[PDB]
Amino acid sequence: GFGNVGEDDLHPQIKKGAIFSPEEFDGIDKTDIFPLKKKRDPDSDHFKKTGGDDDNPFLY
Amino acid sequence: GFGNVGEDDLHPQIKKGAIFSPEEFDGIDKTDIFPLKKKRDPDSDHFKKTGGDDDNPFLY
Amino acid sequence: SSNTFTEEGRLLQTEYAIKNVSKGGTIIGLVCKDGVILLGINKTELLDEREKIYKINPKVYVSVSGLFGDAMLLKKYGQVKAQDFLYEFDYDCDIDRICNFISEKKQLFTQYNSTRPFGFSFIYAGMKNNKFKLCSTDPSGTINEWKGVCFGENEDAINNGLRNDFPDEEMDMERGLFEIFKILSKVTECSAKDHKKYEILYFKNEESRFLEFEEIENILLRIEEEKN
Amino acid sequence: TTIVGVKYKGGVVICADTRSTSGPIVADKNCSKIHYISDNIQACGAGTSADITRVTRKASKVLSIFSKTYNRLPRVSHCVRTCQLHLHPYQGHISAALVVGGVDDTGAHLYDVYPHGSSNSVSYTALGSGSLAAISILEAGYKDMNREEAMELACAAIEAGIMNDLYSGSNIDVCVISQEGREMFRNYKKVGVRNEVPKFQYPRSSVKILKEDIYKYI
Amino acid sequence: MESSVALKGNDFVIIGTDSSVKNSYLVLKREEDKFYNINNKVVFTYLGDQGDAFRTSSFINEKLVYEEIQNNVEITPKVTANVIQKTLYDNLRSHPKNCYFLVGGLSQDGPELYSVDLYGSLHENDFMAVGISTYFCYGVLDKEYHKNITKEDGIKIIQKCFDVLKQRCSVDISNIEIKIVSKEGVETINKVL
Amino acid sequence: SIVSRQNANTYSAEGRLYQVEYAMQAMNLGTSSIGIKTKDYVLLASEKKIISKLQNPSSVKKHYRVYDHIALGFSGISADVKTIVDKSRNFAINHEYLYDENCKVERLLEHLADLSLNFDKKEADEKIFSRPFGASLLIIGYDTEPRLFSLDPSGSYLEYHAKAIGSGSEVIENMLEQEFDPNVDINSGLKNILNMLSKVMKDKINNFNVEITAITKNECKILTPEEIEQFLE
Amino acid sequence: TTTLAFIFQGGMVIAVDSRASAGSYIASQNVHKVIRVNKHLIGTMAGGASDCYFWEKKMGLYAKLYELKNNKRISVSAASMYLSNCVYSYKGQGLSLGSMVCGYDGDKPVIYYVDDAGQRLSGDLFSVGSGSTIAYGVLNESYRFDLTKEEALNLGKKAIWHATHRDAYSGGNVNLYFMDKNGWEHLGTFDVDKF
């Protein structure tokens, strides 16, 4: 809840600094393929399996 | 892979016994309501949501 | 025949490769007080590129005589192995290590039944224990250290001359090259002319430098002075 | 980072912005996002910058060997097939989406290639962040065109991406591949004009040197 | 976790490591020799997972001996350290060794002291403090170390660092092995703190 | 190579493989050795090939222990027998690993026979060489009975009550019809074997040019020069 | 399990507990936790019975093959190194194994503690198993290098008995061994109930 703000500034670590930092709320030049968050390629368009039984797979 | 067999036998624990137990393959008097593994009441038989976009919920 | 002993205990292919080496352009080496002379004789005339003497490390240079393709293959191999040594231990290897690389590969090729020996010989100029050294590798893979040596055309004559008429005197590298040219002229008068095909390296472990035609003719001025 | 490709009657127009970003920080103000594949094929890309260059370089190598060996102008379908066969085995871990366009014996073709190895012949597309802004212009303004109208529509499409996307750039690169050949327009437009500010200068005395070793190049 | 402190002065290098072998809850042994003397000019100590540490140390010692005898390689702290770095790096991304080293000795350029950490990172410095000593002993080393320390002063500084560890660190340390490498050879000192 | 493999595998118009026929000549070119098997002991006596007296007599030993209560004597090309001994030791170790017991000697003989002619194989651990081994072996051991086996380079083996191998093999064989009776004690039989060895061996028999291995239910004894002297005198 | 091995002036003492359990159920009470590989080399298995027994019998074959090759007894250092390498090849695969390879290299006793992590330590006193901590306490109080043979054996016999008295995963018979320059001798299979 309190966010452990300052743990790194409080302990020797044998990044929680004393002041809360922005966006607390990789080494590759990636950029994005679409403005949509995770989308990269067309959606998998097929009728998707639902129902049946997953916790009793072998009781056909 | 090896299963850590005998770790509790080999270390003081500061239940992997010496011989392999069949369990590797609660205190309440509980019986099964149906033979099915983990089902005990009628399935929720509505029309289930699929597709759309759960990655970008707010891009209505 | 391939790489197999004969009834006399001889590897015929290795001996024929050593014979082939004698057909190559003449190359000479000499250890002096302050460095090592590496000398090569090209059949053609070319100054835009050096063909008889090459570099392996800042510490090692090599002369070449024999099959040019095999010689360049193993030159590249030795350079790659020297760079691998530098990668491993973070410092350049001495003459002995390059000799060992090339000798190991050559011996492997004179021991494998389904391959032929490398038909070329190297002379390695370098240093070890702060003293200049001059090694050599035959097609057989044997490593020979020398005060002076010659391979290629007229190798027997120049080698016999080095053994017989050399002053046996520790001397500056300039005097060494002077004596080398004198013996070359003595055993063959073709060395008193046509020096545009010569490559001379004044190997010093850090300050190695090549000699140009003006230096060669300036040296020959001494022979002009003395012979008359 | 908006990319745009437009196909017209006898060629393709491939436009792109000149910005590269790493987080919320602009890394390259005038990056060139159009990669050479052949005299008659060009490829843009969105995603991992290293993957775009290397995937488009593999296509360039395979298409250069093909044209040098068989002495015929490479096909656009050959470029896309090479990219697909390379991207698919990696399951998209090589994150490269391309807009491959070119003109060959069969005419002008424009393809969208996605990181997982799928391709799609197209008439107009946009890629990267800002493609939605670009595709809106392409949807409204696209028709049967010549290179003049196609150039304007594609540049208007990129402009929309630049103006409305945070991660889209400042300049517009353009390349037209037609039956008459390829022509390039680097920094074709400069919509993202910067302000002119004086050059600040420190005093030489503002810095102190402790030790200085001087080395000579030879 | 396993602590080692080393410092170098003029024409001598001090390496001090705790001789106790221990795990989370138990001290298996209290006097273990964690040094390798490849040749009397170079001494390196291995730390971390004992199973990985001793195995890598043995491989490195035998490789250095082989390279010295066969290839006439010059064994110096830099060459030894580069071999450590290559051995650790090769396995880093396939079979990482959970061990780190501290190589010291004399070369033609004078005393050298190298630290090869868990990831194979090699760096030279005037004094080193690996393990927990990285968090406790660097202040003491900064306060006390100076270029012209004598060998006895170096031993005393090592003792002070390991005394800081004795007094403040929660983990128990009782024995330290100090091996001083100098032109006189290698001198071994055993102290119970 | 295919050509060399074919050269190994070529049959003669008489049948028997050419390489086996040549290994038959090879196995004869060695020093003599006698193996005697009786109801309670098996002996193996071999003449040492001391090329020069400067050669260390103890270092030219000719009997190899392949396992507990199995010993191997040989004649012919000595270089080959090193690989055979190593392979036999591996086989015995593997047999104990699988079954926790000392292998029947005939089991080792069958394993070696299987390996012998597999030289045409490309895989490395299920063949002896790329050719027949130029040695003839007298393998003795104790499993439940004193066992004497002879493995020849053709890959075949036979259990014997008595056999001699080496350059003096035929003479000792023609002598065995008279000088051998399985009913005598270990000491008398050992004296007989030593006499038979002396009757064909190059130089005068003594305790330093002779090596004796006697395997019994109680011990796999190898006699030292003192015991060989006690039996010679 | 609780195992114990240590060195004293007169020789070396080894003691184990001989219980084997599968969770709460005690599967066996007469398991032999000592592998005799030769008259001067034994190994005290601890941990996964099948794992330690297999590699110890695989190490016992390497010692046997080494003896045939060199006509000479294998050293403890090489025997334990062979065992250490075998388990190390399976490091990180969950293999659980801890053992002491005890023996004499001629006139010198040495105990090598080996475990599944590839560790290999030579020492004068080791205790391995769940009850090792209890054994360490009893030994620390009374263990001395100057013990007489009878004192050392009783210390090892008593130290294992205490560990069994207080640990759940041990308490079969107290198998006791004494290894000297002339070899080991099985000194008893004492039942902990009859002390």
Added chain:
Amino acid sequence: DISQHYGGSLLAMIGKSSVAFLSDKRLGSGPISVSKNFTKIYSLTPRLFFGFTGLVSDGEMLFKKIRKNYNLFVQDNNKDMEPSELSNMISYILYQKRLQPYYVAVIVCGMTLDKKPYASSMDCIGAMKETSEFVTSGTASKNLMGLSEALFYPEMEDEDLFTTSVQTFLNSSDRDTFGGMGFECLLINPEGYKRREFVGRCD
């Protein structure tokens, strides 16, 4: 996390006929500064330099790999390597580990064979960008980039370039926790280079 374990940052500014290459001399072990004298800039020649930020072991092994390749190339060629060629080769070396990339960022600085300044940078997998003005790397890359964009102007003289780059690097390190305290500036020019070491904050 692994890059900021060792910390450190690089800055390369291009003037006219000169390029300034700056790095901090701190080696980290997390919060603790293990050494105050760790140079992250390597010199193949007086005209070819490059520094690494990220895992230090990766940087050192990449340096040895780059030196191997460069020495072989120089032996195989009649001419020295162009800094553009060196950067392209480094990018190729980085991308051969695409599935297990080095955790480093590379800046390559030097003088072209026609004696013009050159600088470039690339990410973990060789995404290389040639720069005409300046390029930064490491923990303080954000502060360095901002202050360089604020202060850099084209064609600055060698000494003005030195002072401006030094000021930017000092002020960017002062706002970076792992920014180091010891600093090194290689002032590179067609006649060679000058290794200048200066100091800033002492904490």
Added chain:
Amino acid sequence: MFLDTHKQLTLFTSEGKLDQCDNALKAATQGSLSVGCVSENGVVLASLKESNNLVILSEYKKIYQISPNLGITYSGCQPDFRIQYNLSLKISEEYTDIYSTNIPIRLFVEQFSRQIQEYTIKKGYRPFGTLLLIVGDNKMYRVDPSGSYTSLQVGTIGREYTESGRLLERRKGMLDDNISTCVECIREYCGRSVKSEDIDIGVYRGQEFRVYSKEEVQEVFDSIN
């Protein structure tokens, strides 16, 4: 015995020279005449291509491009040259992948020579029966089946290498004039009246190597007459 695939087909003779390599050189020297002429401002490469079959001379080429700056032509066995051309294209593309620049002629020739010399030591393999002229970077290299290479100012490979090099040697100079010279001499060397179809020309000038089209070759002939 049947053919031994493991046999070493290249060996030293008792005269201290490779037997099969000289036969490969003989095979290469029997090929169609092809010449190269270095100039003070460029390099000219020309190759006579015979039409003993119904070959489409417009489509059939004798000079090939390795890279934007390198060109190549051969005398000897056509299939061996095609394999060597595949190999050299691989070399050039690998260098361009690594360094991103066009491969310098010397490095290319060294790597190419090593890779073709590997066949003088490979078991069950004969050396390539092709002589190669490589033009680029204001240089010219002739590569021998042995894998030995030599830089040349004026070179020749093919059957007419006994006479063809004369005018090249004696009239080296301006590139354009040198093109006229080295295309004029070839008439005396071809077995029939040389049409522009029967000759193929490639010229390195400035930065890149370009193979003249049949129209350019026609123009080069018109320039003479």
Added chain:
Amino acid sequence: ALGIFSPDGRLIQVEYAQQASEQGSLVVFSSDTNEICLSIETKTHNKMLIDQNKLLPVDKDLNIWYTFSGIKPDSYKVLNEARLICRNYKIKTGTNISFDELAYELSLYKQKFTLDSSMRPFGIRSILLQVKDMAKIYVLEPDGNYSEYKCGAVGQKSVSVCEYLEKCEEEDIIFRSVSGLGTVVQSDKNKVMSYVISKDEIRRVEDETVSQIISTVSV
């Protein structure tokens, strides 16, 4: 043919390798308890050629020394494999390799190429020698045979020196070896140098005493 029997029953190629191993400069050695002495024939009448030391250490800690006779290039390979065997054995087992085990493994390595169709047998007689607890000298034949030697000689004329050495009256090993080498060498054409291998120490014997010893046999 390689790895095959001849119609006579001979391994022809192995015997050719033996003969090649004979055609080499003669090495003569003689050992007594706690010491070994051996001498090498050298061809250094040619002064430009620098003699190469023919006694090379296999392991300095174990004090194992190596020398050979025959094809010199093969000597480098065999010595490298000997050093590798020592180092690999110490890595695998954590203990120093025993001299007999090293000899066995080196002879097995030599035998490897004798069983190979693709490879040519090593044409070198190699000598392993050690003085740590007692003097032991192993002579490894090119075919893989090996056995300890009290004293002997290897090379072109090994038979004559072996006959001279056999059952001799003298017991001074320096005299033994030096005189044995002196019986055949062409003095001033091929000269003699000798070393004394002692307990973890090595020394050259100097040429004057060698000359005054061989004066008795080469005159």
Added chain:
Amino acid sequence: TTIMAVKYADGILIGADCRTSMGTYVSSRFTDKLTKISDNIYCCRSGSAADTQAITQYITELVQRSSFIDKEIPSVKKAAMAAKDIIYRYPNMLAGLIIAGYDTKPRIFNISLGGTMTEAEWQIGGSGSAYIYGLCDTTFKPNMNLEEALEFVKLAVTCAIKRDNASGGCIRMASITREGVQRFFYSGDKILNS
């Protein structure tokens, strides 16, 4: 996505929608989902765009290879079997195809998601097929003419386009017959504006 194949009198008729969704965004709205395997074999792809393209690129060359190896018109059965092995041998590849063609008789093969191959008289696939199973069941008629089947496909795909968000655009149709393949086009404006 809505794809369907119906076998009518002496022919095969396949219909599909054009929309290529990406989350809520239509990545493209002119995608051709009727992938030609050969001049007489067409397949409708459903599943991963990359994987289904990979399969159809491969079986495209397999049907030709076997077609010329035995000198016969490419076989729909061999194309379907060839697809089934790849879809089965490689579970990581999420692919399901309707392969319909005309070698000697019209035939429809449905390779389900896990490699389950079934011959069918009519088949539907894609996300939008879920909403027209009742419509196709009640409205299908054996041995339709071209006009009847064209209306049947037109009605079914239209009602899938309305309800399914991943299905949209014009209805691409292709009728494979013994005399060849001819494409059709039901413009989306007629569908949407209706």
